[PDB]
């Protein structure tokens, strides 16, 4: 059962696995179904763009916080700063998320600009029903794409103050490690 110089393998097939095998024979069929469903939904919703406008947010975690992506919806504060109510925003094609909060001025200002540009690029048909026939744009994300914010200029002058970056990192670790013991010794005295 164990022979030769081979890696240790862990193949989890000791249950009735053959009863739960899923082969995606309908991969091509489902692609046709999704394309048909998108086409019939676009014809149903008039010239509406088939998707709602989304804000730009910072991804969490230290690993992914260097990038911005699309969030669920604009906050109540962002909607209010744009000059309209949340209820009217939902009926006009804007996603609203009540549980997200604003703590960064850069993110808040950018989402305010997105709402203002969106309002100036759409036409809202009156409730009377005359309904002038306008061409349908199938995507709002492509019309309003998300770009990573600029960080630094291409070239700049060298400014060295004589300090050491390695020394700065080492001292930062040391201060955090011994903060508790230093306070106790100071308090006991």
């Amino acid at each position: 059962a164990i022979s030769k110089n081979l890696p240790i393998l862990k193949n989890h097939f000791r249950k009735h696995w053959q009863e739960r095998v899923k082969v995606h024979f309908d991969q091509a069929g489902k692609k046709v179904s999704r394309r048909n469903a998108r086409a019939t939904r676009a014809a149903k919703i008039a010239p509406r763009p088939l998707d709602l406008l989304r804000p730009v947010v910072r991804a969490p975690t230290v690993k992914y916080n260097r990038k911005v992506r699309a969030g669920r919806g604009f906050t109540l504060a962002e909607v209010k700063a744009a000059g309209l109510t949340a209820a009217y925003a939902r009926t006009i094609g804007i996603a609203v998320d009540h549980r997200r909060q604003n703590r960064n001025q850069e993110i808040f200002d950018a989402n305010v600009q997105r709402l203002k540009e969106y309002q100036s690029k759409i036409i809202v048909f009156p409730r009377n029903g005359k309904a002038p026939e306008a061409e349908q744009v199938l995507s709002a994300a492509a019309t309003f794409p998300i770009a990573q914010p600029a960080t630094d200029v291409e070239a700049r002058a060298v400014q060295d103050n004589g300090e050491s970056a390695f020394r700065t990192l080492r001292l930062a670790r040391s201060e955090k490690k011994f903060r508790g013991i230093r306070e106790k010794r100071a308090r006991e005295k």
Partner: protein
């Protein structure tokens, strides 16, 4: 394909290559990793030393994202600059025209110093740096800026 397998060659040879004496039985020696300490010990002590036992200390609810820190050496530092712009910066090695390299935007966490860089000033922004890497960058006239 079946037509190239040795099963086709074994047609008409009785034992199908498994021998007359030993034969091909179901599971002589057990199934899987059975008998790793009793009758398969020699094959485990060699080719797999360290298999049995425990060493370190446990860590409940590990999150690999906390330990994300890809490393980049100095010998590949200039590859982060587009090729069309590398040549002009190399030939124009001077202050107040030093290129800025943001290694975090390239997906790197710590800068290590292994190779040798050209004697050209460069502004390197990184989260972490080794002691040797900073010295070589400063020796060429550049600086390291810590970011978060």
């Amino acid at each position: 394909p079946s037509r190239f397998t040795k099963t086709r060659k074994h047609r008409g040879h009785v034992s199908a290559g498994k021998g007359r004496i030993g034969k091909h039985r179901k599971h002589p020696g057990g199934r899987g990793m059975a008998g790793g300490q009793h009758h398969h010990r020699i094959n485990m002590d060699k080719y797999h030393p360290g298999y049995f036992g425990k060493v370190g200390m446990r860590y409940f609810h590990k999150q690999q994202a906390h330990f994300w820190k890809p490393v980049l050496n100095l010998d590949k530092l200039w590859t982060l600059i587009p090729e069309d712009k590398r040549d002009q910066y190399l030939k124009s090695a001077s202050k107040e025209t030093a290129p800025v390299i943001d290694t975090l935007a390239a997906g790197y966490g710590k800068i290590l110093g292994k190779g040798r860089i050209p004697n050209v000033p460069v502004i390197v922004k990184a989260r972490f740096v080794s002691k040797l890497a900073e010295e070589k960058i400063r020796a060429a006239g550049g600086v390291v800026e810590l970011i978060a």
